[PDB]
Design an enzyme around this catalytic site. Structure first.
Site, PDB file in Angstrom:
ATOM      1  CG  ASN B   9      -1.925   1.204   1.155  1.00  0.00           C
ATOM      2  OD1 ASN B   9      -1.922   1.980   0.193  1.00  0.00           O
ATOM      3  ND2 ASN B   9      -2.759   1.343   2.182  1.00  0.00           N
ATOM      4  CE  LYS B  11      -0.799   3.224   4.712  1.00  0.00           C
ATOM      5  NZ  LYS B  11      -0.708   3.481   6.176  1.00  0.00           N
ATOM      6  CG  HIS B  94      -6.475   1.931   4.609  1.00  0.00           C
ATOM      7  ND1 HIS B  94      -6.035   2.899   5.488  1.00  0.00           N
ATOM      8  CD2 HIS B  94      -5.468   1.031   4.501  1.00  0.00           C
ATOM      9  CE1 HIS B  94      -4.808   2.600   5.883  1.00  0.00           C
ATOM     10  NE2 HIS B  94      -4.442   1.475   5.297  1.00  0.00           N
ATOM     11  CD  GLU B  96      -3.702   5.668   6.123  1.00  0.00           C
ATOM     12  OE1 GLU B  96      -3.673   5.754   4.876  1.00  0.00           O
ATOM     13  OE2 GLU B  96      -2.751   5.208   6.785  1.00  0.00           O
ATOM     14  CD  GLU B 164      -6.326  -0.585   8.364  1.00  0.00           C
ATOM     15  OE1 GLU B 164      -7.488  -0.402   7.961  1.00  0.00           O
ATOM     16  OE2 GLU B 164      -5.450   0.305   8.371  1.00  0.00           O
ATOM     17  N   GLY B 170       0.124   4.622  15.765  1.00  0.00           N
ATOM     18  CA  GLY B 170       0.263   6.003  16.222  1.00  0.00           C
ATOM     19  C   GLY B 170      -0.152   6.240  17.664  1.00  0.00           C
ATOM     20  CB  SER B 210       4.062  -1.264  12.066  1.00  0.00           C
ATOM     21  OG  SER B 210       5.311  -0.836  11.558  1.00  0.00           O
ATOM     22  CG  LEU B 229      -2.662  -3.203   2.973  1.00  0.00           C
ATOM     23  CD1 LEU B 229      -2.522  -3.454   1.483  1.00  0.00           C
ATOM     24  CD2 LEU B 229      -4.068  -2.689   3.257  1.00  0.00           C
ATOM     25  N   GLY B 231       2.687  -0.868   4.695  1.00  0.00           N
ATOM     26  CA  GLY B 231       2.725   0.572   4.508  1.00  0.00           C
ATOM     27  C   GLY B 231       4.101   1.069   4.122  1.00  0.00           C
ATOM     28  CG  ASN B 232       7.922   3.750   5.931  1.00  0.00           C
ATOM     29  OD1 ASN B 232       8.919   3.182   6.396  1.00  0.00           O
ATOM     30  ND2 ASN B 232       7.996   4.897   5.270  1.00  0.00           N
TER      31      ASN B 232
END
Lengths: 247, 247
Positions: B9, B11, B94, B96, B164, B170, B210, B229, B231-232
């Protein structure tokens, strides 16, 4: 004199094949892009195809842009990404996004701020509902909507306003070209008083109601109507006649 | 056994140049797409570029899809448009989008319906907040979120679930592979309860917390975690090492 601006908002429509056919028809129109802006706004995933098919005399843009920059914003397109792709224009605040996606005045402001920071040109939409017009609040509503973002404008060639007469969209009411003209003049006065006279005289203000081959000439001739953001009619090869009305 | 599924992803990230370099690095990994699914989800306006640059072993998708079909939905991409482009996968729900764009369980249901009608494969996300977990509501919350859409699944290879752990995104909290496993076990039970044993044993359930090169194996080796899935870490050339954990 203000440069006229004729825009095709394709909304959520198109196939690769239909776009091939339509862009071919558009390319057949001879016009001078130094004298008239003509901008096509395809769906995001159609942008590359559309840009490759259209001659450069046609400017291109996308139908929305993120209020956020790059980062963890799944599904969004940032102004920074748009700029890297040389996407020239963005639509901000379209009534359909205000309606279905609850886009607010503040969202519009933040999208405009991000767009201008990244050197994009912005087509910013607003306009009053049937209820608001019935309550005699047209000026109050448009003043509030414009004042939400208008201070962000530095170059008055790079932000283009669009009046959507929502009171005459899907309501059974219809706006006359004169009724549109009256609101456009009101919008220009608001810009004059919040920004300045030179600024107001520079800014393009487009009509974003129903535009077709039959009414385009009557609209464009109005003193304060500088073009249109065209819906369904921009999906037809006859859109070239709408462009011709502004030539 | 279930076919592992590793998704990038991206993003709201990337430039034409960074994507060129990243896809080139990814292309150097020799994997067999019949043995694992590897799916890249670029920004919409990057889709064509990304699809062209990635070798055919890589699958591709987009990060969102409209609940509406074609028509007057400025800024949306319909499932019909995705089908016409052979965009194979979509991400739905998602966190977000639930957070910033107030996407609801009903929106997720409708987006899934549109996707399946158009032969798109859906990566459907859900998960509980820190407050919900602390109130011991993980199971209640996830059951409700899954039941919003699970009855629509007619082929358990074509819908892929993503957990998720928003309580560990965060917040300063960290999810252990053991905690992730228990939620995945819980999710598969919910699918068993609602859809049947064969169906539950078939469906991929991915971890959407993460994931990096360090922790990826500890996660995918869990019995009920079928991939991720990411991310970064998926913006890095070392993402190939995350793919390797599933090979």
């Amino acid at each position: 004199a203000r440069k006229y601006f004729v825009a095709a908002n394709w909304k959520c429509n198109g196939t690769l094949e239909s776009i091939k056919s339509l862009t071919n028809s558009f390319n057949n129109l001879d016009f001078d892009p130094s004298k008239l802006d003509v901008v096509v706004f395809p769906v995001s995933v159609h942008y590359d195809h559309t840009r490759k098919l259209l001659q450069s005399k046609f400017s291109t843009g996308i139908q929305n842009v993120s209020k956020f920059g790059n980062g963890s914003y799944t599904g969004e397109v940032s102004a920074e990404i748009a700029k890297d792709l040389n996407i020239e224009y963005v639509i901000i605040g379209h009534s359909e996004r205000r309606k279905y996606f609850h886009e607010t005045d503040e969202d519009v402001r933040e999208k405009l701020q991000a767009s201008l920071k990244n050197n994009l040109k912005a087509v910013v939409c607003f306009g009053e509902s049937l209820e608001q017009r019935e309550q005699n609040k047209t000026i109050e509503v448009i003043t509030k909507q414009v004042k939400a973002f208008v201070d962000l404008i530095d170059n008055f060639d790079n932000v283009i306003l669009v009046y959507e007469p929502l009171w005459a969209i899907g309501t059974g009411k219809t706006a006359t070209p004169e009724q549109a003209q009256l609101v456009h003049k009101e919008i220009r006065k608001i810009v004059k008083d919040t920004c300045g006279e030179k600024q107001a005289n520079q800014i393009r203000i487009l009509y974003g109601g129903s535009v077709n081959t039959e009414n385009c000439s009557s609209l464009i001739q109005q003193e304060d109507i500088d073009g249109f953001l065209v819906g369904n009619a921009s999906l037809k090869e006859s859109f070239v006649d709408i462009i011709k009305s502004a030539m």
